[PDB]
Symmetry: D2
Subunit: 373 residues, 4 copies
């Protein structure tokens, strides 16, 4: 069969909103690690609206955080359709409306979350989303270091993999759309994108002559970013996670502090699934957890291994309960989440980069020993 996943660059207006929300969160967590943050961003031609509910002792400058975030993305001129130095920044932030052991606090909301891991790649992530991520990240890298200076921030990527008996056979189709300045024709752009973006990223074994390459398929891409389309926080939740390979509970990540289970329980679910796969206990593993508001223990825990489990399924569920703390604040302690580390997650994927806390496999050897070594 075939499977397809997509990603977007840091200049995509939805991702601009996600990065602004988490930039505000990082600046608040730098001063107040226990802060409650629920920050929603709306970006359109000329303006950024930053809203939500915030409870903190921190003192931050929303305008300067927003402008710096958009400067780093690359929109610094009206020719690009958006300028961090001259756009409007509006604020509509308000306020948010008991246990002896803080680890026993009930969940601040109901909801369901999923985590996933698979053998297909080295980072234990599905191949389609990983290489879709690496294509848009390579586009930004080659734009910022001056290799292809005519590139502009907004870009999208899509990769279609072919699977046979659960194994990767190759790449069926590639889509790469990138914004650019007026000073380059489409033919030169397609050659440069193939040479400096696609070929360095996609492994040659998976690229045959039957592979379809769609580079700027409709032609010129000069108007981009917030100029063309609205951007809102939390409208890229499948890009942020597994590119559709695994399920999703619906909650967005960016702009939320670690006490929101929509974010931290999904981080912990990846942490569990990755360590299970890293331990050689399964080839593929999906975890579902759910919470009731005001209840500390998860209302449900599902472990699905798609027939690839190397130990019995009842054992795997036992291992998860034995080695992981899935209570809302227990996640925070287990993963050490009260740190300004979240703007870096707001683009190119929350899962797959080994330096995040939920990407450490520091429990894999323990899980091996606890089962048949």
């Amino acid at each position: 069969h075939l499977f397809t996943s997509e990603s977007v660059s840091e200049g995509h207006p939805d991702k601009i909103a996600d990065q602004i929300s988490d930039a505000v969160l990082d600046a608040i967590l730098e001063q107040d690690p226990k802060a409650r943050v629920a920050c929603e961003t709306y970006v359109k031609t000329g303006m950024v609206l930053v809203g939500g509910e915030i409870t903190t002792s921190a003192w931050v400058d929303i305008e300067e955080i927003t402008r710096n975030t958009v400067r780093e993305i690359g929109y610094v001129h009206s020719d690009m359709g958006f300028d961090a130095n001259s756009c409007a920044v509006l604020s509509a932030i308000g306020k948010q409306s008991d246990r002896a052991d803080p680890l026993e606090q009930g969940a601040g909301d109901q909801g369901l979350m999923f985590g996933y891991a698979t053998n297909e790649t080295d980072v234990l992530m599905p191949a389609p989303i990983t290489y879709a991520h690496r294509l848009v990240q390579r586009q930004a890298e080659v734009r910022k270091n001056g290799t292809l200076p005519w590139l502009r921030p907004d870009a999208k990527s899509q990769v279609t993999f072919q699977y046979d008996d659960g194994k990767i056979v190759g790449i069926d189709a590639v889509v790469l759309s990138t914004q650019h300045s007026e000073e380059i024709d489409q033919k030169s752009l397609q050659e440069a994108v193939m040479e400096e973006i696609i070929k360095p990223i996609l492994p040659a074994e998976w690229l045959t002559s039957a592979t379809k390459f769609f580079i700027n398929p409709t032609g010129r891409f000069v108007i981009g970013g917030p100029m063309g389309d609205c951007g809102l926080t939390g409208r890229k939740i499948i890009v942020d996670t597994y590119g559709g390979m695994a399920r999703h509970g619906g909650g967005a990540f960016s702009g939320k502090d670690p006490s929101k289970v929509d974010r931290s329980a999904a981080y912990a679910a990846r942490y569990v699934a990755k360590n299970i796969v890293a331990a050689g206990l399964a080839d593929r593993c999906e975890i579902q957890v759910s919470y009731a508001i005001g209840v500390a223990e998860p209302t449900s825990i599902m472990v699905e291994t798609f027939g690839t489990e190397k130990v019995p399924s009842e054992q795997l569920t036992l291992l998860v309960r034995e080695f992981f703390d899935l209570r809302p604040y227990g996640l925070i302690q287990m993963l050490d989440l009260l740190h300004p580390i979240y703007k870096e997650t707001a683009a190119y994927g929350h899962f797959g980069r080994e330096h995040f806390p939920w990407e450490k496999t520091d429990k894999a050897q323990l899980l091996r020993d606890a089962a048949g070594l």
Copy 2:
């Protein structure tokens, strides 16, 4: 239900949630599709991409729209919030006195129109399973029913102290694919000051939970969390932000099926984020209704400027009655999955979408993508 730790550790549990029409995110979805419906009523070929932001006191309606239609954004917004039920400042939001701002822009060829290419790239999923009579997953179906039942009894005066904002969550137990029962039910509903929590929980169990959840699925072990944190007076936009497209798992299958990431509301039928998901449900439902599988998941993907899908996958989870390769070929030939082919196949150029913006886009039999008029054809074509 008080089940201690580690007593039934082997049960397979799955959980889904839903929200009422008063949830701020759903208010944004309803406003976006109400704007869409008003435009399609005058201009069925309009391009609409309407994003709504709702907060305490204000509604921001933005996006890009290309149409000959002439609509009143303020009037459409106030009427939608009126019907939802926010008409007084005691509820935290009033449709008659709130602010309505607009930031709508103006959106920056084939011999056969059905061969037009897609307007964007993307992936979309559809799903069906014979667990319910409407071929939907059980948890999301009964999660939808609970919050719609809450709206129903609030509006007809049965429980007049209810307020629009509400959420529900149901945890089902499965044993080898068949429903065995309900393990946990969550029901949080906004209310007025004229009711205590003990009288509220009794009224919720008698007027909402019991008329909806089958008695055969409720035992001594079922946990019931009705307003688990107590008082719920401040709600709606007063409490939280609402954004179009932030309830996309509520809108589809409640987590049982995967998702491509695209929102539905505010988008005209030429956006494959919405129309191809509707088509994906249409083929998944007709495959299951034809008796060719017990549960079926479909993924389609597109490339901008390309008419044919870049990929089509059918997943049957071992429940197929014919080889899965034959199902893939049947889907490609019996359904037009081209962007403008969907529109003609599902008859989508009509103002029908505001109704979809709350309580689920799938499961209600009067929607075009819920018709099962190809099941006997698919069954004939596959042999059986």
Copy 3:
């Protein structure tokens, strides 16, 4: 009063108007100065330029601010609208549920600080006349008194059906500079549904108009227009837009004196638009109180980066008791009209300005620029 056409065509008439604290423009002025006061309470040297936009459902607070202070714009705004009286959706606006947005930016040397140059150019006027005990023009004074009396009787429950939005207008007749009587009175006040117009007009005349306007100035000829168009239920921001700086003639002398065009509210004392107007009133009042003229008008102008005024003019309308050239020299030496000299002369670095944002910046004796502590000095210096 029914005076037919062309009966008393020779009378000299002058008209002024005022508005209550519930008028949407005045709501914007009060919010701007409430933000200013909260900042000066923590940082007296702050630069503030706060502009407010009020509409149905929302308050937009914008401008440029350079300060070490830390203030809550939302809390300051809600409290100001609370005290004005808009606390329910039946009034068209509620302080507890409206939207508050912020768009505040960050504002793009002398051995003697008093020699610092002005921050902008501009012209400003001050005025005084011995027609009233507070040395203010009669029409604007009693126009202010009428709408403040309306707020007074609304807040203490005397007439509880009143609502905050109200306007007044008084036409005086003059004969060679002395008041002869009142020719027309207009009083429009917002109200609730629980009162008819006939009972409203009687209550307005008994509880507002009669306790304020001296009986000697009311004859058979006086026209009284109380709610002349009838019902006045929708009001405040619900009906109209409100903007900082759109009541600058209400804020000063009601048209009797000229104006430079600069608004007062939202501006810290380093803005000569406000401080030099306050100083211009200070010299005009002390000249009249010293007995050196019966009415006095002062104009000062500035150039950006220049400390001394670019021009100083004293106008006495033939009522001077000493040559007008001597008055100009007295003003230049007895008053420090340099931008930061004003501040020290009037002791302006204090949170006193929210009180000025409704019912007039001039006429209330407890304001610094209303003190008359140089009158005996000016009278000594001029001879008399």
Copy 4:
């Protein structure tokens, strides 16, 4: 004595708001001449908010009217701090909540208005405001025709005249501040401003060696327009009228249709005062009119001639009532105001330009004949 008045260019953020409000009014009056318009504009870095109440059968595009207005002003690049092509335009426009002869309609609001005229100049306007207006208009003219291309839209002017026995003796001080690009030093700017802006405008008879000239007095003026300061409709009402020489009732002009007496009764008051002065009946003349809401006849009419009347004062008041219709809708008929003619008034003065309806002196000869010819 001395007297001073100021003006601002079309690029001043308050005037940008005034021009946008009346551009919206003009586009509506083009389709619906009887429309009710109360349009308020708020401009800040990156965004335009257009609000108010409108009752019309017209169909207009607020965004395109706004962008075209700012394009004509000259803000078309982020280097200038504002760009008509990429700024945000938000709309918050709503709705507005009987006579046999429409001329007998009551006034839609109470209020007081003033008109003024004087011999000092040819256009029967006070000298300070007229030459302040002509300095900023000359700045825009020389900027747009390419004479001084380094000029930018935002500018302010101020002129201080000296009077002796009611007659002009000369100009005491001049202030001219103009925005500009980075590519010119302050010395070259001051020489070019003196040669191409000040000297062509201010008459040489009034310029002595004692005249003070303040050109960009604090130095560089690169940041300007909405980038530095907020702009709001109706915050330049003294610039719009007589520069402080005459009184003002308080009402703003721009964004209001002719049925608002704040605007049309002030236009008619200038029309009366100008024809009186044009008729040689007085050297200076100020008119005050007032209205009660729902009442058609003005509540008061004052004629002040400052001792310069050539005929008795009681006669002048009679002439005003005899030759002018000051009822709210009667103003509209007398001056033919139901036409899209108002964007041109939103900068450089509503009074002084002879092609406006209220600037015609077509009743002057009649007023002469009705009195002692």
